[PDB]
Structure formats: structure tokens, C-alpha cells
Amino acid sequence: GPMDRCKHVGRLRLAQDHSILNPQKWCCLECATTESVWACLKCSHVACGRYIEDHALKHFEETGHPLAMEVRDLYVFCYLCKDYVLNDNPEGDLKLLRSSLLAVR
Ligand SMILES: [Zn+2]
Ligand SMILES: [Zn+2]
Ligand SMILES: [Zn+2]
């Protein structure tokens, strides 16, 4: 299995309101694109990635929130590791979020 490469997953705590599973919220809070949609895993921010204007990075630069998930591709990027994340917490929170996003699509 994956090594526990991202040390930021250990303290990940996902919101309980299932809010990101709502596709009506899949659009960038800064420029309103629906093309590239990265949901912050610390707060309810949603913002575009490098394909558009990388407002997701701008969010990290303004808040330090380190983890975001692309709601269609299911990639998780860690802005402190500067890499994509394949390891999960013991509760399997990232897998469940990914599986749930597959399901609501
Ligand atoms: Zn990390
Ligand atoms: Zn944007
Ligand atoms: Zn955030």
C-alpha cells in the first residue's frame, strides 16, 4: 500500500455537513468557472486549479489551508508537501469522500 507520504493527513478533519457533495457548489468562488473545481478540505472554499486561474493556490496563499480535492478527478493536492496525496487517515476519510463524489456524479 501507499506510504504515509503526506504528514498533513493525520490531522485532516472533514466537515460533517456533506456540503461538497452538492454539485451546485462546484464552481470557483472567485471567477465562477465550473471547469476546474478544487474543494478545500479545511473550510468550505471551492476554487479553480491551474487549468483556469489557480484560485485554489490563491486560497492556500491567503489562508494556509493545505489540502484540496478536485471534485471530479478526485486528486488531493497538498500545498505544503507540494504533491498529490494517496495516503489516508485510519478512518479512511479521503477514500469515503472520493467514493461519495464518484457516487453523487
Ligand atoms: Zn502534505
Ligand atoms: Zn477561479
Ligand atoms: Zn480553506
Side-chain angles (χ1 to χ4, degrees), residues 3-15 17-105:
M3 298 309 169
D4 294 315
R5 201 173 280 275
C6 173
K7 301 173 186 181
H8 310 98
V9 176
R11 289 161 170 276
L12 172 67
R13 43 153 29 191
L14 299 188
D17 56 14
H18 280 123
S19 179
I20 198 44
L21 299 180
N22 293 292
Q24 66 206 63
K25 296 208 184 149
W26 293 359
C27 94
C28 181
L29 287 167
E30 295 218 28
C31 71
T33 184
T34 60
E35 189 72 17
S36 170
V37 182
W38 290 80
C40 187
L41 304 183
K42 173 64 186 183
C43 73
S44 73
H45 197 83
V46 177
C48 63
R50 321 180 186 196
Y51 190 72
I52 308 287
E53 295 265 299
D54 214 353
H55 291 135
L57 169 68
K58 183 190 189 224
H59 181 63
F60 172 65
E61 290 177 334
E62 289 176 331
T63 66
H65 295 178
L67 289 160
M69 184 180 288
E70 218 285 345
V71 298
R72 288 186 181 75
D73 289 325
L74 309 182
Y75 308 151
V76 173
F77 193 73
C78 182
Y79 292 100
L80 287 173
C81 289
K82 300 179 160 300
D83 205 359
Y84 297 91
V85 177
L86 294 171
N87 58 291
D88 208 344
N89 65 19
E91 301 75 31
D93 285 341
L94 292 176
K95 180 188 183 299
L96 179 62
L97 175 54
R98 284 187 175 123
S99 182
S100 294
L101 286 165
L102 287 173
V104 295
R105 197 180 169 197

